């Protein structure tokens, strides 16, 4: 499902680990409509843990697949997003999600 279209590679060796938190800044836009998932978190971008599925696959996968200081435009598919039952307005069914994520650091 998910694809990783990096823009800025990161160091290339430092990625999240099982037990670390990821600190990411992202833009979640839809194929051709708008932003639904954006992290314009005043003073604290989004964070989550790897192996606890607190995000969709596209992310656990996608972001795990990114290194510290790497930014990518990930394209996620139903299978890796909110499959079919999305939330009618934010994520209608079978909508592809696009996430311009920047892995800031691990916590």
Curated annotation (Swiss-Prot):
The keyword Acetylation applies. It is found in: Cytoplasm, Cytosol; Sarcoplasmic reticulum membrane. Keywords: Acetylation, Cytoplasm, Isomerase, Membrane, Rotamase, Sarcoplasmic reticulum. One of its GO terms (molecular function) is signaling receptor inhibitor activity. GO terms for biological process: 'de novo' protein folding; amyloid fibril formation; heart morphogenesis; heart trabecula formation; negative regulation of activin receptor signaling pathway; negative regulation of transforming growth factor beta receptor signaling pathway; positive regulation of canonical NF-kappaB signal transduction; protein folding. The keyword Membrane applies. InterPro entries: FKBP-type_PPIase, PPIase_dom_sf, PPIase_FKBP_dom. Its EC number is 5.2.1.8. Inhibited by both FK506 and rapamycin. It catalyses: [protein]-peptidylproline (omega=180) = [protein]-peptidylproline (omega=0). SUPFAM superfamilies: FKBP-like. It is a peripheral membrane protein. Keeps in an inactive conformation TGFBR1, the TGF-beta type I serine/threonine kinase receptor, preventing TGF-beta receptor activation in absence of ligand. Recruits SMAD7 to ACVR1B which prevents the association of SMAD2 and SMAD3 with the activin receptor complex, thereby blocking the activin signal. May modulate the RYR1 calcium channel activity. PPIases accelerate the folding of proteins. It catalyzes the cis-trans isomerization of proline imidic peptide bonds in oligopeptides. Interacts with TGFBR1; prevents TGFBR1 phosphorylation by TGFBR2 and stabilizes it in the inactive conformation. Interacts with ACVR1B and SMAD7. Identified in a complex composed of RYR1, PDE4D, PKA, FKBP1A and protein phosphatase 1 (PP1). Interacts directly with RYR2 and RYR3. Interacts with GLMN; rapamycin and FK506 abolish the interaction with GLMN in a dose dependent manner. Interacts directly with RYR1. Belongs to the FKBP-type PPIase family. FKBP1 subfamily. This is Peptidyl-prolyl cis-trans isomerase FKBP1A.
